[PDB]
Amino acid sequence: TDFLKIELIGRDGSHWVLSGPGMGQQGVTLNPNLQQFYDAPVKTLYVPGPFGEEYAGKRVQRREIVFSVQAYDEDPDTWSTVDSLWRWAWDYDEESELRVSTSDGTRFLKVRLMEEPKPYYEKDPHITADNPIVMTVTATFPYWQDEPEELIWTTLSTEDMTRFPVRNDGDVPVWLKWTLTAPGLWILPDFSWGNDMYSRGREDLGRTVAMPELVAGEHVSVDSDPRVQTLIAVNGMPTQNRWKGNDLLYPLMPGKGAEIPVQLKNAPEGGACKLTRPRWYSRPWSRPGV
């Protein structure tokens, strides 16, 4: 249909249109009955309680998409070329993009081969030159993504301050990344946005964390994502040792946003701050919510 378009960007940069307008132009179409494709798999925890069991939280699970494609062509030789190209588009170690475009925009999913593909029918594939490949791909990051938003603030002053406009339009919290130049002392916002997972949802409404003083050449990447270390110095110096136990604890809660304040002090040559805000969704398409 023209309302929904599905593409694959392979690990080698190949572009395939599996469904929607222009489907099958590269020889591969998408078969029905694809699972764990729309909603992000979330498991809920329950603990014993007075009236049965009590809700104890949720955990999101990695996506396991089992889907079939059909590689077709008129002649067996060119069909074999198409099938080989489709196989070359995938890998186990490196991920490839699965992009869904609808009236709500384009959202992609990084998927990798979970196991070996199951190709062809029971007979010789060159007989039909039109054969199905069963793909069991997995999404380690289970959220459909849009391109993250990047904001740059450069100042020539020794001490300055800026307001970064930030807003989570998705249905899941997101973790911000900062790229801070050196030298200089930065103060970054760690607003709770009312999130109360450290029992400080109201106490940390306007929380700001002061990064350790940066010496020349110690440009830092400050990522709030739990998957990566918060402070990473580009030159390898241990900069988290001068941080005295302080950390960025809170993500950007859905439906929340403001002009978060970023402060720079003691910067003999100014400074540059880059804010990257991811745009994560649990569905390939959804209307905006607020």
Partner: protein
């Protein structure tokens, strides 16, 4: 089912649209003098609406202006009665009114960020309480002093068993840049007492009014933050002799960018400063107090503290 009963039905309402029940839906045979009325009530039974139908020879027609139904909420329960002449009313339909229209949740709901706050503290219980976070000298740097020798209420100050200076940050933040602080204070010795507004999370930068008292140093300063225990004087000082039980109002007006202090019930600022280079906005709405004395005895300390959004 021996007796006649109503039919569970539903009604549809829309904002800006005329509520109308077509006659062919309320069909039947109706002699002359028959009257139909529709009653809308709420969860408690209170009648929130009543309308009269246009009963004809064979149809009943309802047609009301949108302003007549704009007050009927979704979930309000209706009851449609028909009344033949010389007879008691007989309910034909009953049910619920659903609203088939664009839904505006943000209009009805009010976020916690969009709410003026008002905080109060009196220290009459002789305990610090969980709402004050010590600053500068760490945990356990605050204390309560009774002042039982004079007819006075307990006041908060530094823990003079360990420190001679301290700060306290009110645990929660304000929701507006403009803020009003009202402090009833006692002057029992020499010292400096800072009322701090527009503070950051760690009280590194803030505006403040400093009441300093001493042998010959009774004055009021406007200070900026250099840390919870350090400050910088802005402008000239104003002489002010603080007495026990004196009420001072520190108002910061954001649109005027002006922090002023009024003594007692005076309509003129005792002190005033404008255009200070201090960050304001989200993350810069915490408030607090600070004390600094040369000797290990109370100086100027607040018996009563109050804060409110806006000026």
């Amino acid at each position: 089912m021996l007796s006649t009963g109503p039919i569970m039905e539903t009604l549809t309402l829309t904002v800006g649209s005329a509520f109308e029940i077509p006659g062919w839906k309320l069909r039947g045979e109706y002699p002359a003098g028959t009257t139909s009325h529709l009653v809308f009530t709420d969860a408690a039974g209170g009648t929130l609406g009543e309308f009269e139908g246009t009963v004809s020879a064979k149809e009943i027609h309802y047609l009301q202006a949108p302003d007549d139904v704009k007050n009927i909420p979704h979930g309000a329960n209706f009851q449609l009665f028909v009344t033949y002449p010389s007879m008691q009313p007989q309910c034909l339909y009953f049910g619920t009114a659903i609203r088939k229209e664009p839904r505006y949740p943000l209009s009805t709901v009010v976020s916690p960020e969009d709410s003026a706050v008002q905080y109060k503290a009196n220290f009459v219980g002789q305990y610090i309480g969980p709402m004050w976070k010590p600053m500068g000298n760490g945990w356990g740097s605050l204390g309560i002093h009774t002042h039982a020798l004079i007819s006075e209420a307990p006041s908060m100050g530094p823990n003079y068993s360990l420190f001679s200076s301290a700060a306290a940050r009110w645990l929660w933040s304000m929701n507006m840049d403009s803020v009003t602080i009202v402090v009833r204070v006692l002057n029992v010795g020499a010292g400096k007492f800072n009322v701090i507004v527009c503070a950051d999370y760690q009280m590194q930068t803030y505006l403040g009014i400093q009441f300093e008292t001493g042998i010959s140093n009774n004055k009021v300063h406007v200070i900026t933050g250099d840390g919870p225990l350090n400050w910088g004087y802005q402008g000239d000082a104003v002489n002010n002799t603080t007495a026990n039980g004196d009420v001072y109002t520190i108002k910061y007006n954001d649109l005027l960018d002006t922090i002023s202090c009024y003594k007692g019930t005076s309509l003129t600022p005792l002190i005033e400063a404008s255009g200070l280079d201090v960050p304001h906005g989200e993350g810069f709405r915490y408030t607090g107090l600070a004390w600094n004395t040369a000797l290990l005895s109370p100086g100027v300390e607040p018996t009563a503290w109050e804060a409110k959004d806006g000026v």
